[PDB]
Symmetry: D3
Subunit: 317 residues, 6 copies
Amino acid sequence: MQLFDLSLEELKKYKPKKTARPDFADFWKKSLEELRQVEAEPTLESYDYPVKGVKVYRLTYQSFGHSKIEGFYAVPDQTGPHPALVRFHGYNASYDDGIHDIVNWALHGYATFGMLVRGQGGSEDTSVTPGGHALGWMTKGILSKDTYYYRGVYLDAVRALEVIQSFPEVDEHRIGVIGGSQGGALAIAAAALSDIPKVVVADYPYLSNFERAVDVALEQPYLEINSYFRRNSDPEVEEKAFETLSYFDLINLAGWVKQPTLMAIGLIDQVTPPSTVFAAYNHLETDKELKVYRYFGHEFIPAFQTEKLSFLQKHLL
Amino acid sequence: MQLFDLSLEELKKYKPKKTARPDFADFWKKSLEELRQVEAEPTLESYDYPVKGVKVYRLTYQSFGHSKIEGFYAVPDQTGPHPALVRFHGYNASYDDGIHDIVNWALHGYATFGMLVRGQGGSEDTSVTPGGHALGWMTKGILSKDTYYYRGVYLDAVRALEVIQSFPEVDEHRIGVIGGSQGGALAIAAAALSDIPKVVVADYPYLSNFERAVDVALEQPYLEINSYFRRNSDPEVEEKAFETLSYFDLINLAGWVKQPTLMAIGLIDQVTPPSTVFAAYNHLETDKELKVYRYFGHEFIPAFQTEKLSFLQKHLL
Amino acid sequence: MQLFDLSLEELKKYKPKKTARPDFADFWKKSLEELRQVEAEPTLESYDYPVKGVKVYRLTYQSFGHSKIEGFYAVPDQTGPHPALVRFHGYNASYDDGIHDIVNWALHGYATFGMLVRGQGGSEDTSVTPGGHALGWMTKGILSKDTYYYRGVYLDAVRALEVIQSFPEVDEHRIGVIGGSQGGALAIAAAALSDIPKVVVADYPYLSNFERAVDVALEQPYLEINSYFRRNSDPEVEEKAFETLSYFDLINLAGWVKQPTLMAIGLIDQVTPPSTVFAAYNHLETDKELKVYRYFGHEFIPAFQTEKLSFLQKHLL
Amino acid sequence: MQLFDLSLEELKKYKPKKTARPDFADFWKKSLEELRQVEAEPTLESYDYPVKGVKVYRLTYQSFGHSKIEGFYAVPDQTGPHPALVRFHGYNASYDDGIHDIVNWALHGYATFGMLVRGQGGSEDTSVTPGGHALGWMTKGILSKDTYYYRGVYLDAVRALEVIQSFPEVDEHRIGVIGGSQGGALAIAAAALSDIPKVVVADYPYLSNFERAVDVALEQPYLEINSYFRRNSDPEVEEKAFETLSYFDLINLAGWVKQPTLMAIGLIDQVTPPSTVFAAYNHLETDKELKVYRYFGHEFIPAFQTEKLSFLQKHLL
Amino acid sequence: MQLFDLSLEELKKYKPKKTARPDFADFWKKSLEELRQVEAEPTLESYDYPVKGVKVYRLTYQSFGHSKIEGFYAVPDQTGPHPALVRFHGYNASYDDGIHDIVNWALHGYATFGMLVRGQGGSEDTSVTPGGHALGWMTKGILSKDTYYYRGVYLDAVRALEVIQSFPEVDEHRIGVIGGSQGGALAIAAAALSDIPKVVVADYPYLSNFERAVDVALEQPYLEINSYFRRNSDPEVEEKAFETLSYFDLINLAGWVKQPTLMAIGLIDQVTPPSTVFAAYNHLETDKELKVYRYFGHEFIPAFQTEKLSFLQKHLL
Amino acid sequence: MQLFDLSLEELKKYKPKKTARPDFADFWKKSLEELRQVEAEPTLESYDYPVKGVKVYRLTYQSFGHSKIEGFYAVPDQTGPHPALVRFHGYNASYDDGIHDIVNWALHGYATFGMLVRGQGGSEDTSVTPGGHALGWMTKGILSKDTYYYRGVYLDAVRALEVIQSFPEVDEHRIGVIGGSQGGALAIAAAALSDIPKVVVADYPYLSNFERAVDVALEQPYLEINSYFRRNSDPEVEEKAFETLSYFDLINLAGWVKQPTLMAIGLIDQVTPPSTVFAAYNHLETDKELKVYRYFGHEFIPAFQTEKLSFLQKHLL
């Protein structure tokens, strides 16, 4: 791939007007209240894995809609308390629950939980499908903020932080949230909705500036939205869909983030176009940094791995 | 594309061993009993459409899991009773609820209902997502026959027939079930599970001979199963998944079909490979015909449209 | 595919200077005189089709160059006179002479003739091939307006209207011309060259703004022209080719259209780029409407089908 | 691309049954008689080209259907008589009439004429288009041997030989016929139908074993036939089409070739599959050689250029 | 991608005849003698990396042709001696010298050196380019076993083991060699040529059964060989190239491996086709295991990571 | 492909600032001095080829780093002295040493030598590989001007001219240098560094305006540089690489060319983008002409062959 979006000079200035509706704050207050209604009831079960110096567990907990959320939790095999991370996986990109990555993060010294995103990686989704949607999860329940797929998952992410904070081996003051793409969005959304994380690291975050994303993305999954409008052509439906999407859009949630945050984008990224990620970054008002990589797209960026290891070490270890 | 599957001579003889488990019949008896528990409660609402000689309605009814199923119902604007069709749409292939096709079928003289497949085209799916699945609907709830996506939809198809049969303008003895791909499978499954349809037309039916399909298909959506196995590598998971799939596989349901049926396949079809469709055809023991089209794949086949119009006319008009 | 052409704001203003030569009107007067020289001599032969309420015929007639033009003609099976439609098919896109579509139009109440475009769908082309051309019909005879492929075709379209107008079951005052792509161009060209049609519907019309078309189209068939220039590199050949194309270009013919017309374009259309279709539309001076579909390309647009059915009903039924 | 057709061991034995109809010989006798009816009337006009030691001319002549056939004729600029070559170009593959290649052949010592294939490279085609065909020339007039595109072309190739044989600077006993793909087929067909050529060189000849070609070819242009059947689905059309094709098929003409012939195939050729070329070769009963190139497809094969230069030198220089 | 190679049942029995020349052993004896001539002269320089519990160094050493070979060496930050790994990277697949992976292996408890393959990753290649080759390294110096690219690299791998064995913090009896693809071949070749490694892990090993690989591979880099033969068509060149390749082919080296070895293949692997990897496996005579993954190709296989971690733990930790 | 780069109007004015470092001239002076140190020691060996009127030889000579450079040398078989050409082949595009083209040039009247580019077509490269590089030759030794791949190559080209100038059958005052792509760059570079050539012809020259090329090219091989930066992410590496490239960039060498030069570009060229070629052209200060071809990309342009034949005839024959 080659550069296709706004020039770097324009990207640095790109700050689209917020799409937040008047009841944006209220919706999240109400949603968090519904979460609080559900007792977490976490369970831990040891899980054999071929590694020395780390103990691995299957963690489950109850979340929004009485959904049982799961993932692996790996802890350094030494006396705590430990700094912690909740790691969020990419869209349709969880293979064997990310167990190898989670263990590696524990080997770096972090008690780390890889939350499996409901329906994708390995957690329950109790929310009904209200009607038609395009292939995938992006448009499931899109005709109402109350039914939208990411409502439950954002709340699950907040609950993950509430659960790991409650563990005696975890230092509640040294928790980080990390992820790439979908995972980056969940990291930012969790930090926006919760006091618990000290620090955020987000590789090319998804779920940002939807109204531009649909016009600029050249690959899935933003284009599921386009697919949805093709199948449901009522102009009223498009209006409603963008209305519901605004409640989950990082350009609206970013302003609530108070934590130091580190982000990355590759300038040839066709999945999360640079403009969408700069849009999120430019709405942050916090200790922030955006690493820009000219020659990379939506993929592992080796140089950024070192940046993120240094950043987490600085703030948590 | 070009020929890729078994030669025509081998296709004609291809009849794989049934994969039906000992409780196959019992599962469907139990599932039909759960359907019967739900009162249909159908509603009709007139819908304005630019056509003379047809009245159009939005039809809803209650089905398995208390799910509200919907679709357009178009009726010839003349004194009944009328022959009727329940038309089932393709996988992720419902655009504006197929309204134009449904109206056209009514213009041909058939009271026709286009059932929207839960979550795809525009009906509710109340069934929970028990855990992880691949992008799409093919692996939703795949770890149990009781939770699997197509359980609800097959039952919805039966209920569609029960509802349209109850209408006073419909001749209950002249009802046909039709569809292509996913729609063709729903047509066959509905006829296998219900006495109501007089006749079946299935273009290149999907959901057939799963164990071969996963090894021979070159396009989506059978490959969602492959995707699922890549993400969930436990050998026990693959065993369990094929066990649940067997309850919905047309090679196992086909033997229950007593209605005259007409089917089509194109020999270059990469979505529903010819071998999988011949497998279904060769397990039918009924008045049957399979039209074979050398130069067509998974697509509208003009020559077959004339065959199917003649067949429906013969048996219903 | 994504947005690639001029922005919507620019498209609305795009009105390229006409390329019509001084003898534009004279060329068409002369060509219509040559048509008039040929006696139509139409023949009708009944054709069996599995439909109630419509009679189908094979229609033939003589046209420019004593070419025998053909197509199916379907008539509502009831007392006339009937409104009528001449339907024109897409480039290389006639399968079994569009019989199913033609019958469906008759079921909607229109006596309809699907003119098969000479050499493509099933009519005779008596015009000689004067020399080399690129693969396809776009550059056949392109070195002279007198020999160019579309001269005979445009005249066949006019003759189609003259023939159906002569039928006693047809109301001569309620004839419409319709088609998509190539078909949309033939519809507009027919209305420009003939008084007979009352109304025009053209889905993303082809043969428009050739000089821009060859620089912006990303798919066939405008690129046959590029192919031709690659093979025949004389600068005088390119000049001559664009000269002859100007006589058939919709930006030059559009000003002659006096009928109410309805048009459609999808903003991601790579075959008939939006700018080329807006160019044609913006040269119309008549009761006109252009429906714009952000998420569609060169394909069936369900929402537009409802628009066109309402428009034809309003003006013809 | 990789190996896809029969193994080499099977290719060497592949000799499909001839498809020649009982009136095969008679058809060609009649067709040659119709050619004979047209007086050649050749014209030569000098043409400036930047080369020393060669004189270039534009040659025209009259052929079947009173079509004016053309091409460049290049002669060594020295006292004759000269050996000669008629060179036939590939399908839709004539750029600026192949002038540079033609001049190069003259520099190698051959009076050479590059016959432009009617409608493709730059010759007239007077034959009418009787009805519909797929995009391209392969199915033009395919419903009758008398109207089929290649009838005139084959006859033009014979007439080319008759014209160059009449030139005083040409040694009538040292004429070769050469070409690749379509050109290879014209070379073989010309040698089958005419005494005049002394030798034949055919790179991966086209128009061979049509009934297999349509099932094994992976790239155009054999697939135009498939395209044709898709648009015209009557079983009696497919029968008729293969009947007409049989008259032009190299497996039926090959047996008439008495000249030494040299052929080439690449084993990864997707346009003219190896089996189709071996089929032609194995029906030759003459001094013959087939050069097989494992690593080449439908393209220039440098090693074969040396083989063909040696072969022409041996037999002609 | 789908299944394309031999069936699993055939793969298990596929054991192609060895292509080893009579001087195979002598060539390696002589090559190892030339290596021994070069004094290692290793250097270590500390390298800052954001990790606790591991110290990282840049390691260099001298090897065949007095080439300076380099890579990162990461050691657990605790009292030794430690088990060790030499890790070999994939073809053209070294990004920032694989530092993050190397550190992670050290966190798992292994003193690990990632040897950079000369010219690719970051080591010197003193060997001259004797003549033409295809784009890449696969055919560099291919006309002689003495000049061939992999001669130096295999010897570098042996020297890597000699160097890390000399370190006082390394337990010489607990050294493993690991890698995928090119790296898997280097691991196997190193174990074949050296006593030092206790155990081998090779993911889908490359450089195996060249004469089949060139006929079955569908992606790069085996196809560089095909590319080379296209450019250099002398039959003696192809003979000579396969002669030199035989000295480096795993089917010839595998018989020298005495260490327990674990291998993996994915059945849809288009880069290292399953037959080529089974060929290498079936020529091993040692404590061996081959893990077969139906749904994976040439990529990270999560299930195999757990197998390889268990295997290394069992034999080394 | 379609137009993608700057508009023609902007291309004509595109003249990027030179990137030449202060020691640009000195580097080339020093490099030419190192060349002069190596005695040419040319050898000629007759080579059998099937052509009359031309004698072919294998020519070798010694060049920079004591590398033996080779290629075919073809001479008109008549009394000299002859005008001469040094022909340079494309990147990875030498098949059987271009022998057929070389012979054809000799048939046009030119004593012609096709220099084989070290490592690619068939010459020795003695220069070491100092460290890692991307797949290909573009980044070999890129971290220093002294080690960079094209240093030896440019010097080989100069030495080629020195060798053929020394031949008694060659008129030293009528030597031209020609090539396309890589070959065009070598032609221009040779003329910039040497007095010997009278005239230059360069089809779409490569190695021009590197800093833009990496951002605009859509195909290989410029993108090897991008590949290199992906693998070696140090910002200092990118700086150093572009510094090195500046010494070989045609925008910096072009100003030294005093010979009449003819160049070509196709406006849809994705390999050597039009802007990069216009950049080189606009830095020439000499008798120059640029032929622009709207409908061609990186390929043989038939119309330009006639231009180049006329130009060489005018200046050399």
